[PDB]
Amino acid sequence: ELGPDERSYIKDTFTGRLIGEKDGKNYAIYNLKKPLFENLSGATVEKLSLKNVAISGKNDIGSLANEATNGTKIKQVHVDGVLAGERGVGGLLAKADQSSIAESSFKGRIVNTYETTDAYNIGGLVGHLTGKNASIAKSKATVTISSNTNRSDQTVGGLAGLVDQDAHIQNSYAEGDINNVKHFGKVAGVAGYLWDRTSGEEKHAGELTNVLSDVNVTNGNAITGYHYTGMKVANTFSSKANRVVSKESFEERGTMLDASQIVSKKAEINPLTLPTVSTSGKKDSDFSKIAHYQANRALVYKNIEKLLPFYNKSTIVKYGNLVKENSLLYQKELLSAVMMKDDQVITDIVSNKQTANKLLLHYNDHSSEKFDLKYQTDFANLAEYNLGNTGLLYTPNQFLYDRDSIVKEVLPELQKLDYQSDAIRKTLGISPEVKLTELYLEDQFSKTKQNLGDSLKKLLSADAGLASDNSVTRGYLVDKIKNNKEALLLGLTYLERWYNFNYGQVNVKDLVMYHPDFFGKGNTSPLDTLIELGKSGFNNLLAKNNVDTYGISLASQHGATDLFSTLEHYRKVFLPNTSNNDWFKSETKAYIVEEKSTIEEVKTKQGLAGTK
Amino acid sequence: AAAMAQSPASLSASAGAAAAIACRSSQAAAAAAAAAALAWYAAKPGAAPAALIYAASAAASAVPARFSGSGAGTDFAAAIAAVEAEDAAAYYCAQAAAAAATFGAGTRAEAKRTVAAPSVFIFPPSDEQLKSGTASVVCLLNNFYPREAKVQWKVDNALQSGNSQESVTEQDSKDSTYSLSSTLTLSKADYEKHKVYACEVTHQGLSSPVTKSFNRGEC
Amino acid sequence: KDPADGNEVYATNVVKELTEAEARNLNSFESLIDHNILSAREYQSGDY
Amino acid sequence: PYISNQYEEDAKQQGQTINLYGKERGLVTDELVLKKVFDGKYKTWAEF
Amino acid sequence: ILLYDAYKFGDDTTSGKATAEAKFDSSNPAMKNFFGPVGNKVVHNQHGAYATGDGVYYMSYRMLDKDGAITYTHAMTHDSDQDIYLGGYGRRNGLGPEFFAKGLLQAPDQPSDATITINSILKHSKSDSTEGSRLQVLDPTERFQ
Amino acid sequence: AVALAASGAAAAAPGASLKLSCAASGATAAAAAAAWVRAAAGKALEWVAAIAAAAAAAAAAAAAAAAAAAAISADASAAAAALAAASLAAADTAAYYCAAAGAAAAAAWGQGTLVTVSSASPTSPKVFPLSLCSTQPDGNVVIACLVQGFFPQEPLSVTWSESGQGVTARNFPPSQDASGDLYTTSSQLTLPATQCLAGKSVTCHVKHYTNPSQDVTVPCPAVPTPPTPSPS
């Protein structure tokens, strides 16, 4: 049980002096929610794996431990998961003092988009390398790290940050994406501030050797942030990739990926050989070995699995056999959306008896196909629908549980809140001196508090499938909505304020806040992302960082890479065959005046959507 | 603590001249520890002192002076011979005969070189500390030799004395130069009284007078 | 002398009242160009 | 050429260096501009 | 390069262009719903226009008035005279940023101005009373090809 | 191990002994010891108290002035030095480093702590960032943070966020204020022109007395010339 403010599970200063998983197959500690070890000192943890890490802390965070004080031989450690911090983030160890990490790996998101103003050393593998014999050998970090530096002393470095006192990164990789919002900080792909606080002797700064980083770093260098005359990097490599006009402030190296593979002593572990636990692990939905399994319709089975969730594989294949070739169901399909004449209906239990008019299927070709829906073979356990003359069966992903028992309990408590109260100021990272005038959500907060019933009913409708008549699951939902009431309200206000623009007659205020599976990735819950956005901090909810907040909280969960990619994607699904700039000029209310020059050459060049 | 006096107050080495250090102790350094009761410690202002040699019988790693330094009795004389620009700090001698340190003494082994001109900088009104009302104007001149630099403060074409404060930093080993920054504390009303503030510095190296003139509100 | 760069090669234009000894020598039209004289109708007499 | 120092490198090769921000750089003088734009036409701005 | 306006909004009671700099908490709809959310704290002194190198800001000259373009050309010349208006080489070492703008490479401040400038923006037909003392180019896009 | 940390400084009541503890690690009494040195700062400096080896049962000769004013306590579990230094006089305050004083047996090394004993209580230091009124020299950039009415001078550390190769940060010695005898200090640092980009912000890193650091944005940007065209 997570301590209310406990730093780590194991509070002892030196731990796992010899923790090895060598017994049989490799074993992994799934679902860590806080650093495994508070500190380390001469302790060698080896062959340990972490699969689903979701560590968030105000203080420096380290998936394995927060600080390796002396000679900790970390080895064969593979950590995967999302890490979010504020005062400093670390891949494996937030600070490695006189400790060496060899043959380790990392593959997860790292978010530090909070508006903190302090000296932190965030790194995809280790935060701070200060030891003389400290070394990183044969390591790899696929870190899609995003952070906001907003000050010169910060250092975001992918494989490592602020490497100091002769620590050497040898034969390491770095294949992720770094997205610093502004160029103020020293941000680089494979190392950060190689220079040291004491005089920078060419040897006292740091050392790199046979390192490669094909990371799509933005607002920074590809190898080393601070470049000087007596540079101590010995061999560096960087595969050609967009640096978004490239800065070209980093060393240039060749491709021949075959040669690049040899640089890493240990390529990967993947076996985990330890093969059980997970929730998203079973996607079968094992179409093969079914009574009527066919080979050419295999994908079609998947293409119908999104239409009949919580159904037997036999029914899946039986309804897949009825699909015809003339229909557009032979392309890869993402999750659909039920709409009542361009309304994006989500609350099913209120609109299930009413025949929902349209069902919009969004194929992987970014094509929208509208089918007719009628309430047919209606059940009280799970609603059902038919699809035109094809006779296919469609069902919503909700069990139509008693929402009123949860509403009547959680609505009165959510109603008694104020924008200038102490609960919101405590949920945010705000001291009583500064004001909330930079959020610009007061009016929208009052509005979202007024009509809370509709939004709250929509939220419960998509968060979870409650197949329980006993009040234990409804009580769990009540507790999850009550324990984070302030964060829930802040997230619900933020997502409703800056996301309520229409695509013709379709408002994405319901398709972005809710329905997170529209671009695939149905695993995320719309209630979990709201809580993660509420308590994300005052800087993440800030109005100025609306473009970076999407990449940290909403992205990597809705299945999209960035906010602009999401907007262009939505322009493809609805309002197709029209330029995105035309949709922008038609939707916004700001009076936009554009004047193409009279010269025919520039008049023809300006029209193209091409950038620049 | 009896040996608070070190031979001389300030002894200058001319870029390789190598000053000789020979402190005197009230207790005689003759102790039965099978070695002479003398050692030399060199400490820069800030960091804790490091002993150059222990008991004047052996030389520690990275010694400032290659030449040996063995002394006996209350007064001992030794020559560093090897001279480095970096070695420009106070040095303390502690006898190995007894566990006691002659602190409060030290030797200023200064340095003589061509009188390099010292840069002069003038700094304008600052928004910070305005609420306090203690308006302070600072003019900075560093890496300028001679070691002793005369400072003056002129406000509204009038000489200023007493209120102005002058601080001298320890000589840098690499450049063998002394930089002194002048700090002035004035009331907010006092700043209003004089429209322009001028900083003037006089040095042996520059016969011509050098001064910096700034006007409040002119950034 | 300029605060940005240490070199004093930069030149600033200065307009002054010409002396009587120069005035009598301005008889040639070519001399106007050679003695570097400019009309005072629109240009101030102070240094630029 | 008169206002955009594109003849700077030429100056440096011929001479006329200037210490800009602590680095040796070319100093484009009016004599160089006159000898490059109008090499054979004129020799002094007064002649031009 | 963006050309933000002053942020100095004016109520219906103000006689001319008001000088009340907004404080980012202003009730004015523009500050609450757009300029404030896209935070860009600008120095906002009462008079003058400055080009930060990556943008242009109007504090006194209104962007829409006819005197807005005569300041627009000055600000743009300061903003992009290092690799645009020149052949590609930087400014001269001695000449400052104010040399390549007020005297040269700027449209005249007034039509009747007796200055050596190039009327590149303002297009004024002979219909206006400005025809008297035109002392400049009639049409910029017509004369310069 | 060779790590030691000072404590209990900057506010010792007059006439009352103050306690300073050095957190020595793996220290051995037979080959190592802990001492407190009265080196102080720019005044009359003598000596404090130094501890003998464990084989000596923590018993060593002490100065007559030092005797009866300093108390020394040694704990095996603590593994550090407790200074029981007594009847604290007004001029008693100084700087002492806790480490083995070149012991023949073995060497244990050092740091020291600074405390100021006065009737006035440990006022928080104030530091303010000043832009240069005059343009800086070619390549190098000069920016400085001024400390006014700060207490106590020892131990206070001032640092600059931005770091550059061959950076110069002249340190200025404490100066008594005209009223209240407040300490005066300032930090000056120079970095290459390429290192400080236009619009870049630098914050001074100053600690008044082992308390949360405060930052005041200083000016290093070279953004120049504000356009002021006049229509006449």
d(CA A576, CA A266): 47
What residue ranges in B47-203 does DSSP mark as E strands? 50-54, 58-59, 78-79, 90-92, 108-111, 119-123, 134-135, 138-144, 150-155, 158-160, 164-168, 178-184, 186-187, 196-202
Give the one of F198, F229, F232 whose C-beta lies nearest to E71's C-beta: F229
d(CA D44, CA D38): 10
Cα A586 to Cα A368, A498, A504, F212: the distances in Å are: 21, 18, 9, 52
- Residue carrying the six token digits 């000069």: F142
Contact yes or no for E32 and A437 at CB 8 A: no
- Contact with chain C for residue F135, Cβ under 8 A: yes
Give Rg (Cα) of chain A: 26
Instruction: Count CB-CB contacts under 10 A for residue A559.
Output: 19
Q: Which residue of E has its CA nearest to D5?
A: E92
The amino acid at residue B99 is A
Give Rg (Cα) of chain E: 18
B76: which 2 tokens?
A: 């001992």
Question: Which string of b and e fits A36-53 if b means at least 16 CB within 10 Å?
Answer: bbbbbbebbbbbbbbbbb
Long-range contacts of A14-18 (CB under 8 A, 24+ apart): A14/A39, A14/A40, A14/A41, A14/A42, A14/A43, A15/A39, A15/A40, A15/A43, A15/A65, A16/A40, A16/A43, A16/A44, A16/A45, A16/A48, A17/A42, A17/A43, A17/A44, A18/A43, A18/A44
- Residue carrying the six token digits 């890193």: F205
D37: which 2 tokens?
A: 């734009």
Chain-centroid distance, C-alpha A75: 27
CATH number of F126-219: 2.60.40.10
CB-CB neighbors (< 8 A) of F130 in chain B = 123-124, 126, 138
d(CA F203, CA F129): 7
Q: Helix, strand, or coil here: A394?
A: strand
- Cβ–Cβ under 8 Å, residues A152 and F200: yes
Cα B208 to Cα A379, B141, B201, B202: the distances in Å are: 101, 16, 10, 8
CB-CB neighbors (< 8 A) of F198 in chain E = 53
Q: Helix, strand, or coil here: A427?
A: helix
Query: Please, which experimental method was used?
Result: cryo-EM
Chains that touch F (3 or more CB pairs under 8 A): A, B, C, D, E
- Contact with chain C for residue F225, Cβ under 8 A: no
Contact yes or no for F139 and D19 at CB 8 A: no
User: What torsion do the CA atoms of A479, A481, A484, A488 make, to the nearest 10 degrees?
Assistant: 180
- Contact with chain D for residue F194, Cβ under 8 A: no
Contact yes or no for F186 and B167 at CB 8 A: yes
Domain spanning B119-215: which superfamily?
A: Immunoglobulins (2.60.40.10)
B177: which 2 tokens?
A: 């130069």
Give the one of A443, A543, A598 whose C-beta lies nearest to E37's C-beta: A543
Contact yes or no for F161 and A193 at CB 8 A: no
CB-CB neighbors (< 8 A) of F38 in chain B = 1, 103-104
CB-CB neighbors (< 8 A) of F139 in chain D = 21-23
| E123–chain A nearest CA distance, Å | 15
- Cβ–Cβ under 8 Å, residues B104 and F38: yes
The amino acid at residue A463 is D
Q: Helix, strand, or coil here: B66?
A: coil
| E116–chain C nearest CA distance, Å | 13
- Contact with chain F for residue D19, Cβ under 8 A: yes
Q: What is the largest CA-CA distance in chain A?
A: 79
Contact yes or no for A193 and F163 at CB 8 A: yes
What phi and psi values does residue A61 have, to the nearest 5 degrees? Answer: -115, 140
Burial bucket for residue F7 (CB in 10 Å: 0-12, 13-18, 19+): middle
Burial bucket for residue A593 (CB in 10 Å: 0-12, 13-18, 19+): exposed
| A547–chain E nearest CA distance, Å | 11
CB proximity list for F104: less than 8 A, separation 6 or greater: B33, B54, B55, B96
Within 13 Å, how many C-alpha atoms sit on residue A522's CB side? 17
What residue ranges in F77-139 does DSSP mark as E strands? 81-85, 95-96, 113-114, 126-130
CB-CB neighbors (< 8 A) of D22 in chain F = 137-140
d(CA A237, CA A235): 7
Beta strand F113-114 with F157-160: parallel, antiparallel or unpaired? unpaired
Instruction: Count CB-CB contacts under 10 A for residue A32.
Output: 20
Give the one of C3, C5, C6 whose C-beta lies nearest to F134's C-beta: C3
User: What torsion do the CA atoms of F103, F107, F109, F112 make, to the nearest 10 degrees?
Assistant: -10
Q: Which residue of F has its CA nearest to E52?
A: F223
d(CA A549, CA E52): 27
Long-range contacts of C29-34 (CB under 8 A, 24+ apart): C33/D46, C34/D46
Q: Which residue of F has its CA nearest to C5?
A: F138
CB-CB neighbors (< 8 A) of D27 in chain E = 93
Long-range contacts of E99-105 (CB under 8 A, 24+ apart): E99/D3, E100/D3, E101/E74, E101/E77, E101/F227, E102/E74, E102/F229, E104/D3, E105/E73, E105/E77, E105/E81
Contact yes or no for F203 and A151 at CB 8 A: yes
Q: Helix, strand, or coil here: A449?
A: helix
Burial bucket for residue F100 (CB in 10 Å: 0-12, 13-18, 19+): buried
- As a residue count, chain A comes to 612
Q: Which residue of A has its CA nearest to E40?
A: A544
What phi and psi values does residue B181 have, to the nearest 5 degrees? Answer: -110, 130
CB-CB neighbors (< 8 A) of A229 in chain F = 165
**Of the candidates B171, B186, B172, which has an alpha carbon nearest to the alpha carbon of residue B138?**
B186
Contact yes or no for D27 and C33 at CB 8 A: no
Chains that touch C (3 or more CB pairs under 8 A): D, E, F
- Cβ–Cβ under 8 Å, residues B109 and B16: no
Instruction: Count CB-CB contacts under 10 A for residue E114.
Output: 10
Contact yes or no for F227 and E96 at CB 8 A: no
Contact yes or no for F135 and C6 at CB 8 A: no
Beta-bridged to residue F21, according to DSSP, are F82
- Contact with chain D for residue E95, Cβ under 8 A: yes
- Contact with chain D for residue C34, Cβ under 8 A: yes
Burial bucket for residue A214 (CB in 10 Å: 0-12, 13-18, 19+): buried
Q: Helix, strand, or coil here: A551?
A: helix
Beta strand F81-85 with F72-73: parallel, antiparallel or unpaired? antiparallel
The amino acid at residue E132 is G
d(CA D19, CA A591): 51
Chains that touch A (3 or more CB pairs under 8 A): E, F
| D24–chain C nearest CA distance, Å | 12
- Contact with chain C for residue F139, Cβ under 8 A: no
Q: Helix, strand, or coil here: A478?
A: helix
- Put simply, the chain B residues between 110 and 139 with a CB less than 8 A from any chain F CB are 119, 121-124, 126, 128-129, 132, 134, 136, 138
- Contact with chain F for residue C4, Cβ under 8 A: yes
CB-CB neighbors (< 8 A) of E97 in chain F = 224-225
F3: which 2 tokens?
A: 């790590």
Chains F and E touch (3+ CB pairs under 8 A): yes
Instruction: Count CB-CB contacts under 10 A for residue F64.
Output: 6
- Contact with chain D for residue C46, Cβ under 8 A: no
Q: Helix, strand, or coil here: F128?
A: strand
Query: Which one of F159, F160, F161, F163 makes the best mutation probe of the A interface by having the most chain A beta carbons within 10 Å?
Result: F163
Contact yes or no for F135 and C4 at CB 8 A: yes
Chains F and D touch (3+ CB pairs under 8 A): yes
Give the one of A152, A200, A226 whose C-beta lies nearest to F161's C-beta: A152
Q: What is the DSSP letter of E32?
A: I
Q: What is the DSSP letter of E34?
A: I
What phi and psi values does residue F128 have, to the nearest 5 degrees? Answer: -125, 130
Residues of F with CB under 8 A from a CB of A: 159, 161-166, 200-203, 205, 215
Q: Which residue of F has its CA nearest to E66?
A: F231
Beta-bridged to residue A176, according to DSSP, are none
Contact yes or no for D5 and E90 at CB 8 A: yes
Beta-bridged to residue B152, according to DSSP, are B200
d(CA F88, CA F69): 7
